[PDB]
Design a protein around this ligand. Structure first.
Ligand SMILES: [Co+3]
Lengths: 219, 201
């Protein structure tokens, strides 16, 4: 999705301001929002790819103006409705339609073990690797309206495979109920000049990006 | 000149009420357990943060065999010090050297190694850092007081997949015979993102 979240290479966002001595949570409401994510993922109410794409689909001004955990709050209020877990009315009123019909999967007894374990996207088997480290590759020019992880700034550009990480779930399909379609993910190295041109670049600098096998073709 | 889109802008005045309403709803429906949620918050407020990564770095500095294991398998390496899990399932450690300065970003969102660095600060997840780090890293680093030599390569890693990166910064000169603990005190969060260097004694 060619949305406002795809920031790489954009101008006009200004200085990187940083708060001195920033706490983990700057407001109490942020603690609630942050802790809801693992709870809802544990339920299987949605997967992380769907979660990312839900944020991608929010209004561009909303995305810009919202502080970080407002983006998450948006997902909970909207993706849960899209998935049929909550109704629009429940969300608007804050009042359940019919009592405690579910049971939380994330319980106090399993919090530590679940957070210490996580859920790797690595998979045992998937499409064979077409590329080896050292191969020159070009990123395909694709412009899906749905979820993808090839940033706009890389499309059509030529880089060098520098790491093959092995097999992983494909977010483009997993975000849209089309399965995991596991395939190789590579780190691909691009020169500053290749990405940004002669003027806007520095001779030494390189940008590495992690890209799925079928995002690429031989250069 | 207010903050507008740098991550530190003011939230809506009614945000806490909205959040409370959603929380009550999800609890009433039986979707979430508030006691478990409190444990998640305690975990990221008090238990998981950059002191973890700093221990990893200090150990790699004093123990070349550990450093080698860590660079070969980041996840297994950090697990040796008891660090693991959510948003660090598949870790890759980036060794800075006199020839290469590494730094990472997530241009598409906020991806960051929680088990060793904790939750990211607001600037890391905001558009100024995300947009500019892949195009003008030297200009961004300068804003942090860090000037990389012109002849030193900067490698910017965009965290676009489910690998998570952490930088193993270079050990400061003049720290002969420091214990792991004294070395760890020098290792800042910025030094492990690549946006700063370890404290110089
Ligand atoms: Co991200």
């Amino acid at each position: 999705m060619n949305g406002i979240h795809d920031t790489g290479g954009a101008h006009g966002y200004g200085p990187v301001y940083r708060e001195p001595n920033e706490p983990v949570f700057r407001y109490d409401w942020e603690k609630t929002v942050m802790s809801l994510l693992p709870a809802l993922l544990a339920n299987g109410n949605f997967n992380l790819d769907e979660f990312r794409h839900s944020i991608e689909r929010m209004g561009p001004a909303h995305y810009l103006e919202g502080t970080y955990y407002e983006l998450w709050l948006h997902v909970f209020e909207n993706l849960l409705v899209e998935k049929g877990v909550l109704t629009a009315t429940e969300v608007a009123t804050g009042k359940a339609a019919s009592g405690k019909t579910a049971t939380p999967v994330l319980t106090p007894a399993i919090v530590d073990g679940l957070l210490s374990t996580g859920a790797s996207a690595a998979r045992e088997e998937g499409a064979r690797a077409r590329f080896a480290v050292g191969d020159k590759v070009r990123v395909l020019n694709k412009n899906p309206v749905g979820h993808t992880r090839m940033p706009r700034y890389t499309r059509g550009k030529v880089g060098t495979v520098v790491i093959d990480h092995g097999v992983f779930v494909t977010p483009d399909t997993a975000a849209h109920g089309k399965g995991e379609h596991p395939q190789h993910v590579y780190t691909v190295s691009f020169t500053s000049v290749e990405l940004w041109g002669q003027d806007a670049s520095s001779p030494k600098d390189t940008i590495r990006v992690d890209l799925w096998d079928d995002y690429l073709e031989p250069a | 000149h207010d903050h507008h889109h740098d991550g530190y802008q003011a939230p809506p005045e009614d945000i806490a009420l909205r959040v409370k309403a959603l929380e009550s709803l999800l609890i009433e429906k039986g979707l979430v357990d508030p006691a478990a949620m409190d444990l998640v918050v305690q975990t990221y407020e008090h238990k998981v943060g950059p002191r973890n990564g700093a221990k990893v770095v200090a150990k790699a500095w004093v123990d070349p065999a550990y450093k080698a294991r860590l660079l070969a398998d980041g996840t297994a390496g950090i697990a040796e010090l008891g660090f693991s899990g959510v948003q660090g399932e598949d870790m890759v450690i980036l060794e800075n050297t006199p020839a290469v300065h590494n730094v990472f970003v997530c241009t598409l969102c906020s991806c960051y190694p929680w088990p060793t660095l904790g939750l990211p600060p607001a600037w890391y997840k905001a558009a100024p850092y995300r947009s500019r780090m892949v195009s003008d890293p030297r200009g961004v680093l300068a804003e942090f007081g860090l000037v990389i030599p012109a002849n030193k390569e900067i490698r910017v890693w965009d965290t676009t997949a489910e690998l998570r990166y952490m930088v193993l910064p270079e050990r400061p000169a003049g720290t002969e015979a420091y214990s792991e603990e004294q070395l760890a005190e020098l290792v800042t969060r910025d030094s492990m993102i690549g946006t700063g260097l370890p404290t110089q004694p």
